[PDB]
Amino acid sequence: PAVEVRLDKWLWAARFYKTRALAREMIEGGKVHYNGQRSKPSKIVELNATLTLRQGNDERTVIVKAITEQRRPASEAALLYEETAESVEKREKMALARKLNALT
């Protein structure tokens, strides 16, 4: 089955975490959810799955659009998923509010 890529490898390939070991720690900390639930490092990624993950102190919800074992460049990897519009908005709004409480 050459259509089986682990969630920890995937998260690293998609550049969400610097190393697979870190991606594995985040998963085990419950900081990454797969279709709304705790997952595991060895979970095989499926196209269109919904992943919710912690980025520093940001939360992003992305939909898996491609699977690969290669970690490509910044702009290139970024193409293995599509962040949801609701996720981008939530992030923005929190960022804005941050900059607001700042100018006050």
PDB file of N, CA and C in Angstrom:
ATOM      1  N   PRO A   1       0.825  -1.254   0.000  1.00  0.00           N
ATOM      2  CA  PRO A   1       0.000   0.000   0.000  1.00  0.00           C
ATOM      3  C   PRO A   1       0.843   1.281   0.000  1.00  0.00           C
ATOM      4  N   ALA A   2       1.144   1.786  -1.197  1.00  0.00           N
ATOM      5  CA  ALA A   2       1.935   3.008  -1.309  1.00  0.00           C
ATOM      6  C   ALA A   2       1.028   4.211  -1.389  1.00  0.00           C
ATOM      7  N   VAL A   3      -0.021   4.166  -0.573  1.00  0.00           N
ATOM      8  CA  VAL A   3      -0.992   5.244  -0.458  1.00  0.00           C
ATOM      9  C   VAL A   3      -1.270   5.418   1.046  1.00  0.00           C
ATOM     10  N   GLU A   4      -0.258   5.068   1.851  1.00  0.00           N
ATOM     11  CA  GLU A   4      -0.307   5.169   3.315  1.00  0.00           C
ATOM     12  C   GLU A   4       0.802   6.063   3.868  1.00  0.00           C
ATOM     13  N   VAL A   5       0.430   7.252   4.339  1.00  0.00           N
ATOM     14  CA  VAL A   5       1.358   8.207   4.903  1.00  0.00           C
ATOM     15  C   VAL A   5       0.859   8.494   6.325  1.00  0.00           C
ATOM     16  N   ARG A   6       1.768   8.427   7.294  1.00  0.00           N
ATOM     17  CA  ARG A   6       1.405   8.659   8.703  1.00  0.00           C
ATOM     18  C   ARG A   6       1.150  10.132   8.988  1.00  0.00           C
ATOM     19  N   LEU A   7       0.271  10.375   9.945  1.00  0.00           N
ATOM     20  CA  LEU A   7      -0.056  11.732  10.312  1.00  0.00           C
ATOM     21  C   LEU A   7       1.188  12.485  10.798  1.00  0.00           C
ATOM     22  N   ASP A   8       2.083  11.868  11.563  1.00  0.00           N
ATOM     23  CA  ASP A   8       3.219  12.652  12.004  1.00  0.00           C
ATOM     24  C   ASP A   8       4.135  13.081  10.826  1.00  0.00           C
ATOM     25  N   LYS A   9       4.368  12.161   9.888  1.00  0.00           N
ATOM     26  CA  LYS A   9       5.163  12.429   8.700  1.00  0.00           C
ATOM     27  C   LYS A   9       4.450  13.495   7.853  1.00  0.00           C
ATOM     28  N   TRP A  10       3.139  13.335   7.671  1.00  0.00           N
ATOM     29  CA  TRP A  10       2.367  14.302   6.920  1.00  0.00           C
ATOM     30  C   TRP A  10       2.488  15.704   7.473  1.00  0.00           C
ATOM     31  N   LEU A  11       2.306  15.858   8.790  1.00  0.00           N
ATOM     32  CA  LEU A  11       2.371  17.192   9.412  1.00  0.00           C
ATOM     33  C   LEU A  11       3.754  17.852   9.198  1.00  0.00           C
ATOM     34  N   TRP A  12       4.792  17.035   9.213  1.00  0.00           N
ATOM     35  CA  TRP A  12       6.147  17.519   8.984  1.00  0.00           C
ATOM     36  C   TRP A  12       6.286  17.878   7.493  1.00  0.00           C
ATOM     37  N   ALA A  13       5.775  17.011   6.609  1.00  0.00           N
ATOM     38  CA  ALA A  13       5.854  17.275   5.169  1.00  0.00           C
ATOM     39  C   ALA A  13       5.124  18.564   4.837  1.00  0.00           C
ATOM     40  N   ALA A  14       3.986  18.797   5.484  1.00  0.00           N
ATOM     41  CA  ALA A  14       3.191  19.999   5.262  1.00  0.00           C
ATOM     42  C   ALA A  14       3.791  21.233   5.970  1.00  0.00           C
ATOM     43  N   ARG A  15       4.908  21.030   6.668  1.00  0.00           N
ATOM     44  CA  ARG A  15       5.646  22.074   7.380  1.00  0.00           C
ATOM     45  C   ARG A  15       4.947  22.707   8.583  1.00  0.00           C
ATOM     46  N   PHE A  16       4.009  21.992   9.207  1.00  0.00           N
ATOM     47  CA  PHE A  16       3.329  22.541  10.366  1.00  0.00           C
ATOM     48  C   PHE A  16       4.228  22.497  11.586  1.00  0.00           C
ATOM     49  N   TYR A  17       5.146  21.532  11.629  1.00  0.00           N
ATOM     50  CA  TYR A  17       6.084  21.402  12.746  1.00  0.00           C
ATOM     51  C   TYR A  17       7.467  21.125  12.127  1.00  0.00           C
ATOM     52  N   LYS A  18       8.546  21.613  12.744  1.00  0.00           N
ATOM     53  CA  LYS A  18       9.907  21.435  12.193  1.00  0.00           C
ATOM     54  C   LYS A  18      10.414  20.021  11.990  1.00  0.00           C
ATOM     55  N   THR A  19      10.027  19.122  12.885  1.00  0.00           N
ATOM     56  CA  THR A  19      10.456  17.736  12.818  1.00  0.00           C
ATOM     57  C   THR A  19       9.264  16.828  13.049  1.00  0.00           C
ATOM     58  N   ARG A  20       9.416  15.574  12.627  1.00  0.00           N
ATOM     59  CA  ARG A  20       8.361  14.596  12.851  1.00  0.00           C
ATOM     60  C   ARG A  20       8.194  14.342  14.356  1.00  0.00           C
ATOM     61  N   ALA A  21       9.298  14.361  15.112  1.00  0.00           N
ATOM     62  CA  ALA A  21       9.230  14.100  16.567  1.00  0.00           C
ATOM     63  C   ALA A  21       8.399  15.172  17.237  1.00  0.00           C
ATOM     64  N   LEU A  22       8.530  16.409  16.774  1.00  0.00           N
ATOM     65  CA  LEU A  22       7.727  17.462  17.359  1.00  0.00           C
ATOM     66  C   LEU A  22       6.235  17.262  16.958  1.00  0.00           C
ATOM     67  N   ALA A  23       5.991  16.930  15.691  1.00  0.00           N
ATOM     68  CA  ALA A  23       4.624  16.679  15.218  1.00  0.00           C
ATOM     69  C   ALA A  23       4.023  15.515  16.092  1.00  0.00           C
ATOM     70  N   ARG A  24       4.835  14.516  16.388  1.00  0.00           N
ATOM     71  CA  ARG A  24       4.391  13.399  17.203  1.00  0.00           C
ATOM     72  C   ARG A  24       4.026  13.884  18.654  1.00  0.00           C
ATOM     73  N   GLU A  25       4.812  14.809  19.210  1.00  0.00           N
ATOM     74  CA  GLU A  25       4.513  15.321  20.549  1.00  0.00           C
ATOM     75  C   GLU A  25       3.246  16.124  20.607  1.00  0.00           C
ATOM     76  N   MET A  26       3.010  16.890  19.560  1.00  0.00           N
ATOM     77  CA  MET A  26       1.814  17.709  19.511  1.00  0.00           C
ATOM     78  C   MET A  26       0.568  16.811  19.408  1.00  0.00           C
ATOM     79  N   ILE A  27       0.679  15.744  18.611  1.00  0.00           N
ATOM     80  CA  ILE A  27      -0.417  14.798  18.442  1.00  0.00           C
ATOM     81  C   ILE A  27      -0.724  14.148  19.788  1.00  0.00           C
ATOM     82  N   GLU A  28       0.317  13.663  20.471  1.00  0.00           N
ATOM     83  CA  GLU A  28       0.157  13.005  21.773  1.00  0.00           C
ATOM     84  C   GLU A  28      -0.331  13.958  22.875  1.00  0.00           C
ATOM     85  N   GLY A  29      -0.013  15.249  22.720  1.00  0.00           N
ATOM     86  CA  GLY A  29      -0.506  16.252  23.655  1.00  0.00           C
ATOM     87  C   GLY A  29      -1.983  16.588  23.349  1.00  0.00           C
ATOM     88  N   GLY A  30      -2.530  15.990  22.304  1.00  0.00           N
ATOM     89  CA  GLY A  30      -3.901  16.315  21.938  1.00  0.00           C
ATOM     90  C   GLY A  30      -3.986  17.702  21.318  1.00  0.00           C
ATOM     91  N   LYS A  31      -2.867  18.235  20.837  1.00  0.00           N
ATOM     92  CA  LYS A  31      -2.823  19.576  20.211  1.00  0.00           C
ATOM     93  C   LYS A  31      -3.095  19.537  18.716  1.00  0.00           C
ATOM     94  N   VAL A  32      -3.268  18.318  18.203  1.00  0.00           N
ATOM     95  CA  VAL A  32      -3.648  18.114  16.810  1.00  0.00           C
ATOM     96  C   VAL A  32      -4.848  17.169  16.875  1.00  0.00           C
ATOM     97  N   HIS A  33      -5.944  17.515  16.225  1.00  0.00           N
ATOM     98  CA  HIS A  33      -7.090  16.601  16.208  1.00  0.00           C
ATOM     99  C   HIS A  33      -7.322  16.220  14.739  1.00  0.00           C
ATOM    100  N   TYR A  34      -7.812  15.004  14.537  1.00  0.00           N
ATOM    101  CA  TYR A  34      -8.114  14.439  13.203  1.00  0.00           C
ATOM    102  C   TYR A  34      -9.633  14.195  13.226  1.00  0.00           C
ATOM    103  N   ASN A  35     -10.353  14.854  12.325  1.00  0.00           N
ATOM    104  CA  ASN A  35     -11.809  14.774  12.274  1.00  0.00           C
ATOM    105  C   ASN A  35     -12.455  14.941  13.642  1.00  0.00           C
ATOM    106  N   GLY A  36     -11.956  15.958  14.330  1.00  0.00           N
ATOM    107  CA  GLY A  36     -12.525  16.325  15.611  1.00  0.00           C
ATOM    108  C   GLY A  36     -12.152  15.508  16.807  1.00  0.00           C
ATOM    109  N   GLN A  37     -11.180  14.612  16.696  1.00  0.00           N
ATOM    110  CA  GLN A  37     -10.811  13.786  17.837  1.00  0.00           C
ATOM    111  C   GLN A  37      -9.322  13.572  18.005  1.00  0.00           C
ATOM    112  N   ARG A  38      -8.934  13.160  19.199  1.00  0.00           N
ATOM    113  CA  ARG A  38      -7.557  12.825  19.461  1.00  0.00           C
ATOM    114  C   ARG A  38      -7.149  11.839  18.391  1.00  0.00           C
ATOM    115  N   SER A  39      -5.905  11.935  17.935  1.00  0.00           N
ATOM    116  CA  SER A  39      -5.415  10.995  16.948  1.00  0.00           C
ATOM    117  C   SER A  39      -4.126  10.325  17.464  1.00  0.00           C
ATOM    118  N   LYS A  40      -3.342   9.766  16.564  1.00  0.00           N
ATOM    119  CA  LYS A  40      -2.125   9.097  16.960  1.00  0.00           C
ATOM    120  C   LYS A  40      -1.172   9.299  15.836  1.00  0.00           C
ATOM    121  N   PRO A  41       0.131   9.289  16.146  1.00  0.00           N
ATOM    122  CA  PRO A  41       1.208   9.472  15.187  1.00  0.00           C
ATOM    123  C   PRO A  41       1.120   8.583  13.934  1.00  0.00           C
ATOM    124  N   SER A  42       0.700   7.326  14.112  1.00  0.00           N
ATOM    125  CA  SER A  42       0.649   6.343  13.020  1.00  0.00           C
ATOM    126  C   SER A  42      -0.623   6.367  12.184  1.00  0.00           C
ATOM    127  N   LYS A  43      -1.563   7.232  12.535  1.00  0.00           N
ATOM    128  CA  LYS A  43      -2.804   7.363  11.776  1.00  0.00           C
ATOM    129  C   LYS A  43      -2.507   7.626  10.289  1.00  0.00           C
ATOM    130  N   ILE A  44      -3.146   6.876   9.409  1.00  0.00           N
ATOM    131  CA  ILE A  44      -2.894   7.075   7.988  1.00  0.00           C
ATOM    132  C   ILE A  44      -3.796   8.195   7.535  1.00  0.00           C
ATOM    133  N   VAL A  45      -3.194   9.193   6.914  1.00  0.00           N
ATOM    134  CA  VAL A  45      -3.906  10.381   6.467  1.00  0.00           C
ATOM    135  C   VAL A  45      -4.814  10.082   5.269  1.00  0.00           C
ATOM    136  N   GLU A  46      -6.018  10.653   5.293  1.00  0.00           N
ATOM    137  CA  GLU A  46      -6.949  10.495   4.167  1.00  0.00           C
ATOM    138  C   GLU A  46      -7.203  11.841   3.523  1.00  0.00           C
ATOM    139  N   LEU A  47      -7.434  11.871   2.201  1.00  0.00           N
ATOM    140  CA  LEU A  47      -7.729  13.153   1.565  1.00  0.00           C
ATOM    141  C   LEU A  47      -9.068  13.688   2.151  1.00  0.00           C
ATOM    142  N   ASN A  48      -9.165  15.011   2.260  1.00  0.00           N
ATOM    143  CA  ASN A  48     -10.331  15.710   2.788  1.00  0.00           C
ATOM    144  C   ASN A  48     -10.614  15.542   4.253  1.00  0.00           C
ATOM    145  N   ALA A  49      -9.638  15.042   5.000  1.00  0.00           N
ATOM    146  CA  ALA A  49      -9.831  14.910   6.451  1.00  0.00           C
ATOM    147  C   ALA A  49      -9.692  16.321   7.014  1.00  0.00           C
ATOM    148  N   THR A  50     -10.312  16.555   8.161  1.00  0.00           N
ATOM    149  CA  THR A  50     -10.206  17.870   8.810  1.00  0.00           C
ATOM    150  C   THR A  50      -9.253  17.751   9.988  1.00  0.00           C
ATOM    151  N   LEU A  51      -8.182  18.538   9.938  1.00  0.00           N
ATOM    152  CA  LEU A  51      -7.178  18.575  10.973  1.00  0.00           C
ATOM    153  C   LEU A  51      -7.258  19.939  11.659  1.00  0.00           C
ATOM    154  N   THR A  52      -7.238  19.925  12.985  1.00  0.00           N
ATOM    155  CA  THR A  52      -7.269  21.158  13.787  1.00  0.00           C
ATOM    156  C   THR A  52      -5.960  21.057  14.552  1.00  0.00           C
ATOM    157  N   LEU A  53      -5.144  22.095  14.428  1.00  0.00           N
ATOM    158  CA  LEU A  53      -3.844  22.027  15.078  1.00  0.00           C
ATOM    159  C   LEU A  53      -3.431  23.373  15.622  1.00  0.00           C
ATOM    160  N   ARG A  54      -2.602  23.291  16.649  1.00  0.00           N
ATOM    161  CA  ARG A  54      -2.050  24.446  17.340  1.00  0.00           C
ATOM    162  C   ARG A  54      -0.749  24.897  16.648  1.00  0.00           C
ATOM    163  N   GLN A  55      -0.678  26.185  16.318  1.00  0.00           N
ATOM    164  CA  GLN A  55       0.493  26.809  15.690  1.00  0.00           C
ATOM    165  C   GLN A  55       0.968  27.872  16.692  1.00  0.00           C
ATOM    166  N   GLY A  56       1.928  27.536  17.550  1.00  0.00           N
ATOM    167  CA  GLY A  56       2.386  28.499  18.538  1.00  0.00           C
ATOM    168  C   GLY A  56       1.162  28.717  19.399  1.00  0.00           C
ATOM    169  N   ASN A  57       0.515  29.871  19.264  1.00  0.00           N
ATOM    170  CA  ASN A  57      -0.704  30.084  20.022  1.00  0.00           C
ATOM    171  C   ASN A  57      -1.919  30.284  19.099  1.00  0.00           C
ATOM    172  N   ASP A  58      -1.706  29.991  17.815  1.00  0.00           N
ATOM    173  CA  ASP A  58      -2.728  30.085  16.783  1.00  0.00           C
ATOM    174  C   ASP A  58      -3.408  28.719  16.627  1.00  0.00           C
ATOM    175  N   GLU A  59      -4.659  28.738  16.200  1.00  0.00           N
ATOM    176  CA  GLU A  59      -5.354  27.503  15.924  1.00  0.00           C
ATOM    177  C   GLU A  59      -5.677  27.592  14.449  1.00  0.00           C
ATOM    178  N   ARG A  60      -5.459  26.495  13.740  1.00  0.00           N
ATOM    179  CA  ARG A  60      -5.772  26.474  12.326  1.00  0.00           C
ATOM    180  C   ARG A  60      -6.541  25.195  12.061  1.00  0.00           C
ATOM    181  N   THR A  61      -7.557  25.280  11.204  1.00  0.00           N
ATOM    182  CA  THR A  61      -8.315  24.088  10.832  1.00  0.00           C
ATOM    183  C   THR A  61      -8.042  23.944   9.345  1.00  0.00           C
ATOM    184  N   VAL A  62      -7.452  22.824   8.920  1.00  0.00           N
ATOM    185  CA  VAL A  62      -7.163  22.614   7.510  1.00  0.00           C
ATOM    186  C   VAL A  62      -7.785  21.314   6.989  1.00  0.00           C
ATOM    187  N   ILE A  63      -7.986  21.299   5.677  1.00  0.00           N
ATOM    188  CA  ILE A  63      -8.541  20.158   4.996  1.00  0.00           C
ATOM    189  C   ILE A  63      -7.367  19.560   4.189  1.00  0.00           C
ATOM    190  N   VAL A  64      -7.141  18.252   4.313  1.00  0.00           N
ATOM    191  CA  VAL A  64      -6.043  17.594   3.571  1.00  0.00           C
ATOM    192  C   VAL A  64      -6.430  17.500   2.062  1.00  0.00           C
ATOM    193  N   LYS A  65      -5.604  18.064   1.215  1.00  0.00           N
ATOM    194  CA  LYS A  65      -5.816  18.073  -0.241  1.00  0.00           C
ATOM    195  C   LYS A  65      -4.804  17.155  -0.990  1.00  0.00           C
ATOM    196  N   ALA A  66      -3.710  16.795  -0.329  1.00  0.00           N
ATOM    197  CA  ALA A  66      -2.712  15.913  -0.977  1.00  0.00           C
ATOM    198  C   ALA A  66      -1.896  15.156   0.074  1.00  0.00           C
ATOM    199  N   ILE A  67      -1.320  14.009  -0.312  1.00  0.00           N
ATOM    200  CA  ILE A  67      -0.451  13.232   0.568  1.00  0.00           C
ATOM    201  C   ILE A  67       0.907  13.046  -0.092  1.00  0.00           C
ATOM    202  N   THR A  68       1.960  13.087   0.707  1.00  0.00           N
ATOM    203  CA  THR A  68       3.310  12.988   0.189  1.00  0.00           C
ATOM    204  C   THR A  68       4.223  12.627   1.359  1.00  0.00           C
ATOM    205  N   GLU A  69       5.459  12.236   1.056  1.00  0.00           N
ATOM    206  CA  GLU A  69       6.404  11.896   2.112  1.00  0.00           C
ATOM    207  C   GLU A  69       7.539  12.873   2.104  1.00  0.00           C
ATOM    208  N   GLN A  70       7.509  13.775   1.132  1.00  0.00           N
ATOM    209  CA  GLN A  70       8.547  14.780   0.979  1.00  0.00           C
ATOM    210  C   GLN A  70       8.175  16.102   1.632  1.00  0.00           C
ATOM    211  N   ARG A  71       9.140  16.723   2.319  1.00  0.00           N
ATOM    212  CA  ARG A  71       8.924  18.020   2.921  1.00  0.00           C
ATOM    213  C   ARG A  71       9.530  18.958   1.863  1.00  0.00           C
ATOM    214  N   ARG A  72       8.691  19.704   1.155  1.00  0.00           N
ATOM    215  CA  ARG A  72       9.165  20.627   0.125  1.00  0.00           C
ATOM    216  C   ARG A  72       9.292  22.039   0.692  1.00  0.00           C
ATOM    217  N   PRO A  73       9.652  23.036  -0.145  1.00  0.00           N
ATOM    218  CA  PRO A  73       9.797  24.407   0.359  1.00  0.00           C
ATOM    219  C   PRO A  73       8.563  25.169   0.869  1.00  0.00           C
ATOM    220  N   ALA A  74       8.838  26.150   1.732  1.00  0.00           N
ATOM    221  CA  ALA A  74       7.799  26.974   2.370  1.00  0.00           C
ATOM    222  C   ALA A  74       6.501  27.154   1.581  1.00  0.00           C
ATOM    223  N   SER A  75       6.579  27.803   0.425  1.00  0.00           N
ATOM    224  CA  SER A  75       5.397  28.046  -0.397  1.00  0.00           C
ATOM    225  C   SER A  75       4.865  26.744  -1.046  1.00  0.00           C
ATOM    226  N   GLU A  76       5.767  25.826  -1.367  1.00  0.00           N
ATOM    227  CA  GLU A  76       5.393  24.559  -2.003  1.00  0.00           C
ATOM    228  C   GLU A  76       4.644  23.550  -1.112  1.00  0.00           C
ATOM    229  N   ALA A  77       5.163  23.271   0.079  1.00  0.00           N
ATOM    230  CA  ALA A  77       4.486  22.316   0.958  1.00  0.00           C
ATOM    231  C   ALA A  77       3.062  22.823   1.150  1.00  0.00           C
ATOM    232  N   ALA A  78       2.984  24.075   1.621  1.00  0.00           N
ATOM    233  CA  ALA A  78       1.731  24.786   1.873  1.00  0.00           C
ATOM    234  C   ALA A  78       0.559  24.337   0.977  1.00  0.00           C
ATOM    235  N   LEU A  79       0.882  23.742  -0.182  1.00  0.00           N
ATOM    236  CA  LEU A  79      -0.133  23.234  -1.122  1.00  0.00           C
ATOM    237  C   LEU A  79      -0.682  21.833  -0.844  1.00  0.00           C
ATOM    238  N   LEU A  80      -0.368  21.220   0.315  1.00  0.00           N
ATOM    239  CA  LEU A  80      -0.887  19.852   0.664  1.00  0.00           C
ATOM    240  C   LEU A  80      -2.233  19.957   1.417  1.00  0.00           C
ATOM    241  N   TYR A  81      -2.624  21.183   1.698  1.00  0.00           N
ATOM    242  CA  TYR A  81      -3.854  21.435   2.440  1.00  0.00           C
ATOM    243  C   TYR A  81      -4.477  22.799   2.100  1.00  0.00           C
ATOM    244  N   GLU A  82      -5.712  22.982   2.549  1.00  0.00           N
ATOM    245  CA  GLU A  82      -6.446  24.220   2.357  1.00  0.00           C
ATOM    246  C   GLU A  82      -7.060  24.614   3.702  1.00  0.00           C
ATOM    247  N   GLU A  83      -6.537  25.652   4.316  1.00  0.00           N
ATOM    248  CA  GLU A  83      -7.105  26.113   5.576  1.00  0.00           C
ATOM    249  C   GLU A  83      -8.569  26.533   5.344  1.00  0.00           C
ATOM    250  N   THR A  84      -9.481  26.269   6.283  1.00  0.00           N
ATOM    251  CA  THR A  84     -10.873  26.649   6.045  1.00  0.00           C
ATOM    252  C   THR A  84     -11.011  28.167   6.170  1.00  0.00           C
ATOM    253  N   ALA A  85     -12.003  28.701   5.473  1.00  0.00           N
ATOM    254  CA  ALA A  85     -12.275  30.133   5.486  1.00  0.00           C
ATOM    255  C   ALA A  85     -12.597  30.530   6.917  1.00  0.00           C
ATOM    256  N   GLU A  86     -13.353  29.684   7.618  1.00  0.00           N
ATOM    257  CA  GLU A  86     -13.724  29.970   8.997  1.00  0.00           C
ATOM    258  C   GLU A  86     -12.461  30.013   9.848  1.00  0.00           C
ATOM    259  N   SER A  87     -11.508  29.138   9.558  1.00  0.00           N
ATOM    260  CA  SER A  87     -10.273  29.131  10.336  1.00  0.00           C
ATOM    261  C   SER A  87      -9.446  30.419  10.066  1.00  0.00           C
ATOM    262  N   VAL A  88      -9.336  30.818   8.795  1.00  0.00           N
ATOM    263  CA  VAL A  88      -8.564  32.033   8.481  1.00  0.00           C
ATOM    264  C   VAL A  88      -9.220  33.248   9.181  1.00  0.00           C
ATOM    265  N   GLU A  89     -10.540  33.367   9.075  1.00  0.00           N
ATOM    266  CA  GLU A  89     -11.239  34.470   9.727  1.00  0.00           C
ATOM    267  C   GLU A  89     -10.999  34.487  11.220  1.00  0.00           C
ATOM    268  N   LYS A  90     -11.133  33.338  11.876  1.00  0.00           N
ATOM    269  CA  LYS A  90     -10.944  33.337  13.317  1.00  0.00           C
ATOM    270  C   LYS A  90      -9.554  33.809  13.693  1.00  0.00           C
ATOM    271  N   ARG A  91      -8.566  33.359  12.938  1.00  0.00           N
ATOM    272  CA  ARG A  91      -7.198  33.740  13.223  1.00  0.00           C
ATOM    273  C   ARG A  91      -7.069  35.258  13.059  1.00  0.00           C
ATOM    274  N   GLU A  92      -7.527  35.765  11.920  1.00  0.00           N
ATOM    275  CA  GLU A  92      -7.466  37.197  11.626  1.00  0.00           C
ATOM    276  C   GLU A  92      -8.095  37.978  12.761  1.00  0.00           C
ATOM    277  N   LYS A  93      -9.383  37.744  12.990  1.00  0.00           N
ATOM    278  CA  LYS A  93     -10.063  38.475  14.038  1.00  0.00           C
ATOM    279  C   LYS A  93      -9.280  38.495  15.332  1.00  0.00           C
ATOM    280  N   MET A  94      -8.727  37.365  15.751  1.00  0.00           N
ATOM    281  CA  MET A  94      -7.964  37.388  16.992  1.00  0.00           C
ATOM    282  C   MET A  94      -6.728  38.271  16.897  1.00  0.00           C
ATOM    283  N   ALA A  95      -6.102  38.270  15.724  1.00  0.00           N
ATOM    284  CA  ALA A  95      -4.914  39.074  15.459  1.00  0.00           C
ATOM    285  C   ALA A  95      -5.283  40.564  15.528  1.00  0.00           C
ATOM    286  N   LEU A  96      -6.375  40.928  14.856  1.00  0.00           N
ATOM    287  CA  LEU A  96      -6.879  42.299  14.834  1.00  0.00           C
ATOM    288  C   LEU A  96      -7.165  42.783  16.252  1.00  0.00           C
ATOM    289  N   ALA A  97      -8.008  42.040  16.971  1.00  0.00           N
ATOM    290  CA  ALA A  97      -8.353  42.389  18.340  1.00  0.00           C
ATOM    291  C   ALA A  97      -7.079  42.602  19.138  1.00  0.00           C
ATOM    292  N   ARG A  98      -6.082  41.760  18.895  1.00  0.00           N
ATOM    293  CA  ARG A  98      -4.805  41.882  19.588  1.00  0.00           C
ATOM    294  C   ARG A  98      -4.247  43.275  19.309  1.00  0.00           C
ATOM    295  N   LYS A  99      -4.077  43.600  18.029  1.00  0.00           N
ATOM    296  CA  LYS A  99      -3.558  44.903  17.628  1.00  0.00           C
ATOM    297  C   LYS A  99      -4.434  46.066  18.123  1.00  0.00           C
ATOM    298  N   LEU A 100      -5.697  45.777  18.441  1.00  0.00           N
ATOM    299  CA  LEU A 100      -6.624  46.792  18.937  1.00  0.00           C
ATOM    300  C   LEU A 100      -6.345  47.093  20.395  1.00  0.00           C
ATOM    301  N   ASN A 101      -6.427  46.070  21.240  1.00  0.00           N
ATOM    302  CA  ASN A 101      -6.165  46.252  22.663  1.00  0.00           C
ATOM    303  C   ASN A 101      -4.787  46.879  22.816  1.00  0.00           C
ATOM    304  N   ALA A 102      -3.999  46.810  21.747  1.00  0.00           N
ATOM    305  CA  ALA A 102      -2.659  47.374  21.742  1.00  0.00           C
ATOM    306  C   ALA A 102      -2.726  48.902  21.634  1.00  0.00           C
ATOM    307  N   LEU A 103      -3.414  49.390  20.602  1.00  0.00           N
ATOM    308  CA  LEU A 103      -3.568  50.825  20.360  1.00  0.00           C
ATOM    309  C   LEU A 103      -4.562  51.437  21.342  1.00  0.00           C
ATOM    310  N   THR A 104      -4.558  50.912  22.563  1.00  0.00           N
ATOM    311  CA  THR A 104      -5.453  51.372  23.622  1.00  0.00           C
ATOM    312  C   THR A 104      -4.971  50.822  24.963  1.00  0.00           C
TER     313      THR A 104
END
